Each structure stands twice: as structure tokens, then as C-alpha cells.
């Protein structure tokens, strides 16, 4: 079952994207600092949901 | 052992554990390994208890819809399970379970049944607050 | 490398104290009368501050605690 | 021919859509209802005036009618009489009501002279054998649980105890 | 080439072994084998009372939970006519009317669970749990024993019982609905139970079948009309049929029944003499004196209770029908208080008989369906 | 009952079915009844990779 | 088959199982084995048992002449719940004790 | 002058074990009592409200009751409904066929003793205990839905009463004896064809 789930939504949702483009959450800041933990945090989050 | 702090000397108090009875076992686990040996009672259905501790109790079994007077003359259970019980003893642990022409098993009652430990080391049991505590019954009595 | 300390340890901490014993408290609170998607609201974290939420889960401990000396 | 299934192949798709997407949405006000079932232990069932639990005993209420055997369904308990010269009644010595072997008839607690054979509730039997239950006289009463004098209950009224709507 | 079913049998009913041969996946010929659950009432039928034998009935009847008593007061109070008021009748009434459902729930329910609906098993339970207020409050503990006296009934309904019905009594009316519209969704539901198990009413009966089961093959066998049962005919209601017999046929002909059980207990509430319970009871201290009240009508007993009553030679049948099946006591009238020989004629009884010849060329599934829909339980066919 | 709600029930009904103390049956044995089992998990666990 | 009265402590088998296993759980059913309350209701010492073994004879050899019909096996195991009890309403022999419920099928002891 | 005494105590139960060798089978016997799962089984008159148990009025399942509809996977099984000499022959080889942990208890006052069925009839068996040892009587017919899950948080505790020795009292021996016959053999009655 999860890994049924895990790959349907690695395949036709966007894996560790967010509702807005996986790079653009970098771009409109114009600077990052410890985006580190909160990227792989928020990886485990936006996809496990 | 907790239990130790308030069993060897007071051998009179009462459980009041939460209502499930999952928090208590391993309390009694430990007391098998100085000479105290398991009793579970039960108390509610029995009349004096004195007669149920110290003498010859005709209990009449539950019958079977005839037969006119038929008692087997049951015994009592505390010189017999000494007489089962080793000479390395320490006392006879026991649970009044139902502690909470009959006798109603009141107070009074608990007080003659916290003789026997002094003249069985037994613990009356009801039911209380979430956190396992116990309380000496014999104050709670009368 | 000083006072890396207390920013590291701070965070660190409330990670993993304060929802433990208020996950407990917001699912008691509403459980049969919620609305369509507000369980997924503390569900979800039950998995982020789970550093401590196992901490304050079933395992939260009732040893003997040897008394003061 | 297949023109027939190249329109109905969207017909039995669209069918089991309208049926399947429909029993979602209305289940989706049952998946998040708010219906609070059945609580913990705690809180048992409300109980009216008229039901049967643990009968009672007496030595003042039973005149020794003794129609104790008359009305249970296999005559459950003993019948004794035992040589008295009062005026004709000879006394009452012997009697041990089972209930593993009553079946909670009990019938004669309509025909019995004054109030003897009653009704109670309670039901805490940690049966660890069958020959331990000599219910006698009194401590049959033992000041039930008490649903109402209990300090860690709140029993709401159920269906059709509470109030309309 | 052949296995058993199981007597852990995991089904509704409790414990049928069922020998069957099976080809790899489709089976060829299958056996029950009954007889597990002897209650043996036919013995101690004899050795017995009324009073003390009163309580009996509703043990090998759980599912009914009173379709076993009409009979069994049928042979007491209406053999040797101790008059039994049209007041008592209609209580009567409202309890045989209320098992309709009592009934209708607990093979519905248990029904969705076979046929396929996997969720609604605990709908219908919380459904019931009213019906489990109203049985305690009624007369007895649980399945409200002991209800039936000889001269009427043990006692008048309490005042919150009868006018009490609202709740509930318009509450499954708009219920009803849900079940129907949820049947005709999701074809899965209609398709593997549609085409199973035909039947013809010809066979239905040339096999001495009855119940709901036979009125879906348009032979409409309801015998809740041939019988002056307590004269309670004063009523009005609507005849439940189809025109099939199958099992989707039992599933329509046991959905549209229970919609006249709570039709005839609003003629009652407000047709019965007394009407609601507080009724009658703030109109007998105005009139304490005399009146149509405590007479021939609005009389819960009318003679004295007690185990001491002679019988003549008189052996009447009554084929009183529940909506599972048919009932029936025969006895051979005697002299004596209690009587000869008893005898009982169960639908359980009378239903597996084509059991056997149901489930032909089918396969584990095809049988699974048939057994879950032919209404059927333990209990009343060993006795 | 299992703490507050069941987030120790699942490992105890893990740490349950543990000891359980496992049957064999007689016709077939461990030339591949312990075999069975271990392609099913296997083929599942190295999934994740 | 194997259809044996497999009643508490009175297990008259009707198919041969004498090894740790009997490996088809009939053995073809050519021996007719018993074994002893497995659930340990009365400890054995040999000698009690030599009396059950000895009246076995009696039992399967002195009054047999039915088919292998368990209306047979009713009639051994009615007369084995009673030897047992004989043997033990003279006290030669008494009842589990050890760690589980203790439970009394013929009540609790009696003073004679 | 007693009547059928008790056997003695043969050990001297002298022992004392380390806690860290301890405390593991206590918390593993904890669980296994607080996660244990229904074996479905039920017939007659003491049975029904056994399915009220899953539902609004009375939900068992809250402790993870998990009905099992099979022997060889669950260890609870509730003997409801009274039953008879038949049912029986098959009903003990599901005891017979579970992991040992099984600690079975009664449920309806009509299997402890066969009470509504105890006047005359050669059908009914007097009592559940005289063909399985199980450890807890229920009474009422119908059991009192309440008192059922009472008499489970009573068992719940006798498990919590177990040790590390404790696990070695569910080892058997065998009283295999060796003993032929000399009768004729009768070949199946339960035919199954129609």
C-alpha cells in the first residue's frame, strides 16, 4: 500500500515540488541561508502529505 | 520494593488502584520470591468470614433444583495452606477482591481480617484515582 | 562556535517538548465533531515534532523515581 | 460492432462515476459526521424502573411460602422444613440461590406475599469457580453500585429516555 | 475433491457445516449438516408448567425475539377463550408489529454484511439500539421476557413507552429511503446479487416455503390477513410482495415490509382503546368508579395467574407467520394440566429443505450470496 | 486504552504476534514454509531502495 | 475418520498417534491411541496410572463387540469419568497443582 | 479428616531474577494481554449481544479487539451460546489448535452450568469446563453486555501476573499408551452427495 501511494504521487504529483515551482522557492528571496534542514524537513512534508 | 515499604510491616492496607487492573500485576509479581504466596479471594458471597478463616464452614453448593439438605461441610483455607506451605515462609498474601443468612463484609469485618495478620497479609481492593496509590484500610475502617 | 549552544539547543528543545503534551490535548478536545479535513491538521505534525511527540506518547514513563537523598 | 461500444464505453464509465462520486460526497458528511458514539466504560447505559439483576434474600419477607422451587424454570433452589412446634411452620435453616444456574426468572417476585424476591443491577462476578456463590440473607443488599452515587459518573439518558429531538 | 465449509462457519447464523465437492473453483454439490444445537424443548415441554415453562420461548428465539410467543400464549389464553380484551390485543399488536422490525433489522443488517455493503453493519445496530430502550423498559431485561402472561399479558406498557414511539417512529421512516437509494447505487451491489438463486412460486409452494422469500414470486402468502389473531384486524395495512423470488427479490419484498410495521403502530397509539399509556393512566383516577375502563376492556388480566388450570381434549393449530416464516405448535389436546406431546413447526425448519437444491452449478461466492440473502438462522430449526 | 490513544498499540500488537509461539503445520515444513514469507517481504522492502 | 469422543480428559483416539506427531494425524487409524489429560488436571505417578492401564483390557477386550462406532467410545468414556473419580474419592490421587486456574470440575475438597 | 486434599507444593519457590531480565517479559506479557484478539464463535441463547459489542452501544474494539475468524491466528475465544453434545467433537480442536497464550475464558450462564437446559434432555453438556479448561465464567442469559467486558479487564490482569518462568508451564509431555483393538470398522455415514 505505501509503496503504491508513495509512487503514484512520484509520478503524476509533483515529488518534493511544492504548489508553486521546486526552484522558484529560491529565487523570489534573492538569498538563502540555512535552507539545508528546512529543504529536507519540507521535502519529507510536501510529499508524505 | 515499594510494596515492601508497606506490606512487611503494616500487613494491613487496602489497594486503590485505576479501574483496569493494567498497572498493578507487576506489583504482585514481586512477591512471590520471600514466601508470600498468592490468595485471591473474591470476598462477596461468603457470610462471617471468621468461620471462612479460621473454622469448619459448611458452604452449600449450588444446588441442582432437589435434594433436601446437602452440605459437604467445607473446610477453612488458612491452617490447611499453612499445613501445604514450607517452613520458609514469611506470610500468607492474600486479596480481598470484594472489598467494596449472610454477614455483610463490612469494616468490622476488615478489622477481624486484619487480625489474622497479626493472630495472612491480606489487601482489600477498590477501585480509585488514575495513579496506583495504596492507603492502610484499617483507618478507612470505622 | 562559542554561543552556538543555546540557537542550536533552544530549537532543538521546543521540537521536541511542547507539542508532545498538546497533540494529546487538541485530539481529546474535538474528536467526533470535527469538520472534513480538520483532522488533518494535527495528524500530520504527529509526524514533525515526532523527535518528542514517541517521548510523550504511551511511553511516557512511571518508574519509582528514587526519592531525594 | 464497436461503434455501439465507442459510445457506450464513456456511458458505463460515466454511470459508474455518477455512482461512485455521488456515494463519496454523501459519505463525506459520515467519514467527518459529528455523531459521538458509544464513550469509554466509564460511562455505562441510563437504566429505567423495570429490568432484572441480582435477586435478593430475606429471613422477614419470606413467611417460608416457599414457592422458591414453583417459579424458577428448573425449581433451582432447595426446599427445608425442619420439625418446628411454634404452630404448624416449620422454620427456614436451609437455601443457597446460584445464579449460574437461575436464569433470571425469578417469577415470584410477582406472587410473593410481602416484597421478598426484588431486582437489583450489578453484575461483577470474577467467577474462579462455580461453588462460590451462596448468596444468603443481607449482604445480598451490599449498597449496590449506585450508578448515581458514583462521583466519576455523568450518565446522559439514551434514545428513548431522553427528551424528543 | 471435496471439503467442508466449516463449522466455525463464518457467516451470520452461527454454526452450519457444509460438505461440498469442489473442481478447482466452482463446486458441483453441497450438504448441511444440522442438528448441532439441540434445545431439545420438545422433552421438558412435557415436564413442565405454563408459568415456569413461560420464559422458555424466547431462548431458541433470539433472532425473532417474540414471534415465539403469539403461538405459545396462543395455546393458553385463546384455546380455552379467557377473553382477551381488544385493548390487550392492541398492545399485542404493537409488539408483534415492532418484531417486524425486529426482525427486518436483524437480517437486513447481517444481509448488507453478506451481500457486499461493508459499511453499514454498525448503522443498523445504532439503528436498533432504541428498540433495545423500549424491550427493557417493556417488561424484561434485554429481549423483554417474559411479556406474555396466560389471562393477557405480565403488564400494561409503561407511559413512556407508547406515545414515545416519535422519535424513532418517524426517525427510520426517512431512513427507510437511504437503503434504497444506496441498493441501485454502485451496480457491484446489483450485479452479483441479481440472477442468483430463482425460484417460482409454483415451487415456492410445491416445497412448503412461505415468508417474504415466497410473497416475492407474486403468490403473496402474507398471513397476516387469514387470522382473526386477537381481533386485531381493525387495522389497515398494505400487502409487501414482488414478482420474482430470487434474491434480489427478498432484498425488495424485505425492504418494503418494515414501512407498515410503524403504519400500524400509528393506527394503534391512537386506535387503541387506551391509546398511550399516560392516557389511560390520567383517565382512571377521574373514573376510578366505573366505567368502560378496568371492564372487559382496558383490563390487563382477567382472571387469576397462577399454575393450576385443566385442559379438554382440544388439538388446534394456529399457522401464525413471522416475516422469516411460518410458526406452528400442534398438541394433542389432553386432559391433564400440562399436556401429552408438544410440537413445533419452525421456518428454519422449513426453509433448508430446499437448500441443497438452491446452490446448483454455482460457485463458493454464488452460495455465499444465496445463504446471506435466503434469511436464514440457527435456533429455531433444531428447537 | 493503549496510553493515550493507539500510538503504542501498534507496536504492541507487533511485539504480540512476536512470540505467538509459531506452529508448523506438518504437511510442508520448513523446506518452504519459512521460505514463503521472506520473497513476500523482500520483494517489497528492496522497493525502497 | 478420525472421529473420537474428545471430551476433557477423556480422549479415546481412534487413529493411531503415539509419536511426537503422528504425521497424518490419523496414521491410517489401525491402533486406536489415548492420551492422559494433556492439560496436567491430575499429576500421574506410573503406579496410579497401572490400574487405568490394566482395566483398559476390561474395557476394550471384556465388553466390545460393536462396530468402531463412537456409540463404543460413549461407552468407555463413561466409565473412565467415573474410574477417575472412584480413585480420587479415596484420595489416591489429586488434582493439577501448578501456575494455571485451578479450576474444580467436581467442586472443591470435602472433609469426608 | 479432609477429603481429597491438594497435592504439596514440590518446589520450595526460592529464586530472585534481575530486573533487566525481567521487566522484558513483563512489558511483553503487558502487551500481550493489551493487544489481544476475539476468536469468532457463537450459537444459542447467550450469544447475539456478542455483536452489539462492535457497535454504538457497547465498542469492545476500542482496546484493538481485533476479531480473528480463524483458530490457528487469534488466542480470545467466547463460548457463547449454550451448547450441546454436538459442536463440541469439533468445537475443542479449535482450543487445541491456537498458540499457547491462549488463556480462554466463558461467557453465558447456560455454559457454566446449562441452566435453562437442566431439567431433562440428552442434548445439552452441563457446563463448558468439563471439556476445556478455560479460566473465567461469565453468568447471565443473555450475558449482561457490560459484565463481559468487566470479566476481561479482570483476565486482563492474571496475564500481568506472569514472570520469565512463568514461560515454561505451556510445555507438554506425553502419556502416549500403547493399546490395539480387535472390532469392526464402519465406513463414513456423512455422505455428501444429493
Redesign the interface.
Known amino acids: 500500500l505505501l509503496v503504491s501511494s508513495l509512487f503514484v504521487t512520484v509520478l503524476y504529483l509533483g515529488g518534493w515540488n511544492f504548489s508553486i515551482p521546486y526552484i522558484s522557492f529560491f529565487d523570489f528571496f534573492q538569498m538563502n541561508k540555512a535552507v539545508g534542514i528546512l529543504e529536507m524537513t519540507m521535502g519529507i512534508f510536501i510529499t508524505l502529505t | 520494593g515499594r510494596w515492601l515499604d508497606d506490606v512487611e510491616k503494616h500487613k494491613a492496607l487496602a489497594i486503590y488502584p485505576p479501574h483496569e487492573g493494567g498497572y498493578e500485576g507487576r506489583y504482585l509479581n514481586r512477591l512471590r520470591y520471600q514466601g508470600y504466596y498468592f490468595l485471591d479471594l473474591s470476598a462477596r458471597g461468603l457470610g462471617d468470614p471468621e468461620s471462612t478463616l479460621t473454622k469448619i464452614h459448611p458452604v452449600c453448593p449450588p444446588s441442582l433444583g432437589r435434594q433436601p439438605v446437602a452440605r459437604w461441610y467445607f473446610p477453612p483455607e488458612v491452617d490447611y495452606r499453612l499445613s501445604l506451605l514450607h517452613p520458609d515462609a514469611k506470610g500468607l498474601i492474600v486479596w480481598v477482591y470484594e472489598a467494596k443468612r449472610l454477614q455483610v463484609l463490612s469494616k468490622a469485618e476488615l478489622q477481624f481480617l486484619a487480625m489474622l495478620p497479626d493472630l495472612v497479609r491480606v489487601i482489600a481492593e477498590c477501585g480509585n484515582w488514575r495513579k496506583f496509590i495504596w492507603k492502610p484500610l484499617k483507618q478507612i475502617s470505622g | 562556535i562559542l554561543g552556538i549552544l543555546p540557537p542550536v539547543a533552544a530549537i532543538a528543545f521546543f521540537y521536541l517538548f511542547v507539542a508532545p503534551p498538546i497533540i494529546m490535548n487538541w485530539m481529546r478536545l474535538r474528536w467526533f465533531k470535527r469538520k472534513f479535513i480538520e483532522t488533518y491538521l494535527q495528524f500530520m505534525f504527529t509526524y514533525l515534532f515526532f523527535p518528542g511527540l514517541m517521548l510523550w506518547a504511551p511511553f511516557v514513563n512511571f518508574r519509582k523515581f528514587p526519592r531525594d537523598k | 460492432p464497436m461503434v455501439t461500444g465507442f459510445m457506450s464505453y464513456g456511458q458505463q464509465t460515466i454511470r459508474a462515476t455518477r455512482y461512485i462520486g455521488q456515494s463519496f460526497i454523501t459519505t463525506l458528511s459520515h467519514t467527518n459526521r459529528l455523531p459521538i458514539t458509544i464513550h469509554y466504560p466509564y460511562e455505562k447505559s441510563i437504566t429505567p424502573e423495570r429490568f432484572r439483576g441480582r435477586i435478593h434474600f430475606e429471613f422477614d419477607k419470606c413467611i417460608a411460602c416457599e414457592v422458591c422451587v414453583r417459579v424458577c424454570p428448573i425449581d433451582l433452589p432447595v426446599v427445608d422444613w425442619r420439625f418446628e412446634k411454634d404452630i404448624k411452620r416449620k422454620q427456614l435453616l436451609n437455601y443457597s440461590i446460584d445464579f449460574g444456574v437461575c436464569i433470571f426468572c425469578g417469577n415470584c417476585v410477582e406472587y410473593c406475599p410481602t416484597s421478598c424476591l426484588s431486582m437489583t443491577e450489578e453484575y461483577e462476578l470474577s467467577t474462579y469457580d462455580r461453588h462460590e456463590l451462596n448468596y444468603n440473607q443481607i449482604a445480598l443488599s451490599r449498597l449496590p453500585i449506585s450508578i448515581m452515587g458514583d462521583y466519576t459518573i455523568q450518565t446522559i439518558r439514551n434514545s428513548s429516555e431522553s427528551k424528543i429531538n | 475433491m ?1 471439503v467442508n465449509m466449516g ?2 462457519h ?1 457467516s451470520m447464523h ?2 452450519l457445516r457444509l ?3 469442489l473442481d478447482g473453483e466452482d463446486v458441483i ?3 448441511p ?1 444440522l ?6 424443548m420438545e ?2 415441554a412435557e ?3 405454563i ?6 420461548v424466547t ?2 428465539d ?2 425473532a425475539t417474540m414471534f415465539t410467543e403469539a403461538i405459545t400464549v396462543n395455546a393458553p389464553e385463546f384455546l380455552e377463550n379467557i377473553q382477551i380484551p381488544q385493548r390487550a390485543s392492541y398492545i399485542r399488536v404493537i409488539m408483534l408489529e415492532l418484531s417486524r422490525i425486529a426482525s427486518h433489522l436483524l437480517w437486513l443488517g447481517p444481509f448488507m454484511a453478506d451481500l457486499g455493503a461493508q ?1 453499514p ?2 448503522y443498523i ?2 439503528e436498533r ?2 428498540i ?3 424491550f ?8 423483554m ?2 411479556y406474555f402472561r396466560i389471562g393477557g399479558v405480565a403488564a400494561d406498557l ?1 407511559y ?2 407508547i406515545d ?1 414511539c ?3 417512529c418517524d426517525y427510520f421512516l426517512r431512513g427507510v429511503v437511504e437503503y434504497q437509494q ?1 441498493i441501485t ?3 457491484i451491489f446489483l450485479e452479483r446479487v441479481e440472477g442468483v438463486g430463482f425460484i417460482s412460486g409454483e415451487e415456492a409452494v410445491n416445497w412448503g416455503l412461505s415468508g417474504p422469500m415466497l410473497r416475492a414470486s407474486g403468490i403473496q402468502w402474507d398471513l397476516r390477513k387469514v387470522d382473526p389473531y386477537e381481533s386485531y384486524n381493525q387495522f389497515d395495512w398494505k400487502v409487501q410482495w414482488q414478482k420474482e423470488g430470487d434474491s434480489l427479490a427478498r432484498y425488495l419484498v424485505r425492504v418494503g415490509e418494515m414501512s407498515e410495521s410503524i403504519k400500524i403502530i400509528q393506527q394503534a397509539i391512537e386506535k387503541i382503546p387506551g391509546g398511550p399509556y399516560e392516557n389511560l393512566e390520567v383517565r382512571r383516577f377521574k373514573k376510578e368508579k366505573n366505567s368502560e375502563w378496568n371492564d372487559f376492556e382496558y383490563k390487563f388480566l382477567g382472571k387469576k395467574p397462577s ?1 393450576n388450570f385443566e385442559l379438554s381434549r382440544q388439538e388446534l393449530y394456529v399457522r401464525v407467520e413471522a416475516p422469516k416464516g411460518e410458526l406452528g405448535i400442534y398438541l394433542v389436546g389432553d386432559d391433564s394440566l400440562f399436556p401429552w406431546r408438544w410440537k413445533i413447526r419452525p421456518p428454519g425448519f422449513i426453509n433448508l429443505q430446499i437448500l ?2 438452491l446452490v446448483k452449478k454455482m460457485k463458493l461466492a454464488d452460495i455465499m450470496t444465496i445463504l446471506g440473502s435466503i434469511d436464514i438462522i ?2 429455531e430449526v433444531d428447537r | 486504552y493503549a496510553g493515550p490513544l493507539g500510538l503504542l498499540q501498534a507496536i504492541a500488537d507487533g511485539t504480540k504476534l512476536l512470540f505467538k509461539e509459531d506452529i508448523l503445520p506438518s504437511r510442508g515444513d520448513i523446506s518452504l514454509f519459512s521460505i514463503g514469507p521472506s520473497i513476500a517481504v523482500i520483494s517489497v522492502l528492496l522497493s525502497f531502495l | 475418520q478420525w472421529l473420537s469422543c474428545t471430551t476433557r480428559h477423556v480422549r479415546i483416539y481412534a487413529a493411531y498417534i503415539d509419536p511426537e506427531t503422528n504425521a497424518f494425524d490419523q496414521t491410517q487409524t489401525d491402533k486406536l491411541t489415548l492420551m492422559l489429560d494433556p492439560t496436567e488436571e491430575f499429576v500421574w505417578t506410573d503406579e496410579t496410572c497401572q490400574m487405568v492401564y490394566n482395566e483398559f483390557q476390561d474395557l476394550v477386550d471384556h465388553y466390545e463387540g460393536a462396530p468402531l462406532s463412537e456409540y463404543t467410545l460413549r461407552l468407555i468414556g463413561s466409565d473412565l469419568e467415573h474410574y477417575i473419580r472412584k480413585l480420587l474419592y479415596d484420595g489416591e490421587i489429586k488434582y493439577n497443582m501448578r501456575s494455571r486456574v485451578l479450576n474444580f470440575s467436581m467442586g472443591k475438597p470435602r472433609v469426608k | 479428616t479432609v477429603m481429597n486434599l491438594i497435592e504439596f507444593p514440590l518446589l520450595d519457590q526460592t529464586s530472585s531474577n534481575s530486573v533487566i531480565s525481567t521487566t522484558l517479559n513483563d512489558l511483553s506479557n503487558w502487551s500481550r494481554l493489551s493487544s489481544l484478539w476475539p476468536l469468532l464463535y457463537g450459537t444459542s441463547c447467550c450469544f447475539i449481544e456478542f455483536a452489539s459489542l462492535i457497535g454504538s452501544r457497547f465498542d469492545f474494539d476500542r482496546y484493538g479487539l481485533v476479531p480473528r475468524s480463524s483458530p490457528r491466528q487469534a488466542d480470545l475465544i467466547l463460548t457463547a451460546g449454550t451448547v450441546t453434545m454436538k459442536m463440541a467433537p469439533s468445537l475443542v480442536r479449535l482450543y487445541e489448535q491456537m498458540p499457547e497464550p491462549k488463556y480462554v475464558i466463558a461467557m453465558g450462564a447456560c455454559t457454566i452450568t446449562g441452566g435453562m437446559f437442566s431439567t431433562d434432555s440428552y442434548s445439552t453438556v452441563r457446563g463448558v469446563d468439563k471439556l476445556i479448561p478455560v479460566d473465567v465464567y461469565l453468568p447471565g442469559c443473555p450475558p449482561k453486555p457490560e459484565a463481559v467486558i468487566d470479566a476481561l479487564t479482570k483476565l486482563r490482569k492474571k496475564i500481568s501476573r506472569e514472570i520469565v518462568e512463568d514461560r515454561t508451564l505451556s510445555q507438554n509431555k506425553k502419556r502416549c499408551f500403547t493399546t490395539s483393538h480387535k472390532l469392526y470398522v464402519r465406513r463414513s455415514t456423512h455422505t455428501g452427495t444429493y
Not at chain 5, 442438528?35 to 431439545?40: A, I, T, V
Not at chain 5, 427493557?136 to 429481549?143: H, I, K, Q
Request: aromatic content about 16%; some cysteine.
Open positions: 471435496i463449522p466455525q463464518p452461527g454454526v460438505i461440498v465437492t454439490d453441497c450438504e449438516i442438528g448441532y444445537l439441540h434445545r431439545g422433552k421438558i415436564n413442565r408448567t408459568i415456569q415453562y413461560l420464559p422458555y431462548r431458541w433470539y433472532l459499511t453493519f454498525f445496530f445504532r439500539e432504541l433495545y430502550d423500549l427493557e423498559a417493556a417488561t424484561g431485561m434485554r429481549m421476557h417474559n409503561p413512556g413507552w414515545k416519535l422519535d424513532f444506496l447505487q454502485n451496480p399454575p441443497p437444491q440457527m435456533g
